[PDB]
Design a protein around this ligand. Structure first.
Ligand SMILES: CC(=O)N[C@@H]1[C@@H](O)[C@H](O)[C@@H](CO)O[C@H]1O
Ligand SMILES: *[C@@H]1O[C@H](CO)[C@@H](O)[C@H](O)[C@H]1NC(C)=O
Ligand SMILES: *[C@@H]1O[C@H](CO)[C@@H](O)[C@H](O)[C@H]1NC(C)=O
Lengths: 34, 34
């Protein structure tokens, strides 16, 4: 699946996780631009 | 319940999916953006 807010949830800042990596997390609302 | 994008997930087109029937699916964002 494409990585977005739909299939992921946030928890804390990034320095507390060992082995964390970076990648885009698209928000479907942005293209809508309602 | 009324079929909406929140309670339904999607995977693939409805050609090879056996028995699929076409029905309206309403996105809650569109009425709010009207
Ligand atoms: C617009 C469209 O494709 N509508 C389809 C129709 O062609 C098909 O006969 C029916 C049964 O599968 O499901 C719906
Ligand atoms: C993710 O990006 C932040 C900010 O650009 C950076 O500080 C961090 O090192 C990056 N993490 C990885 C795993 O590349
Ligand atoms: C449902 O059953 C009928 C009667 O056995 C059959 O003609 C039809 O093809 C079946 N539909 C599916 C999608 O299997």
């Amino acid at each position: 699946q494409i990585i977005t807010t739909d299939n992921t949830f946030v928890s804390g800042n990034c320095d507390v996780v060992i082995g964390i990596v970076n990648n885009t997390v698209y928000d479907p609302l942005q293209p809508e631009l309602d």
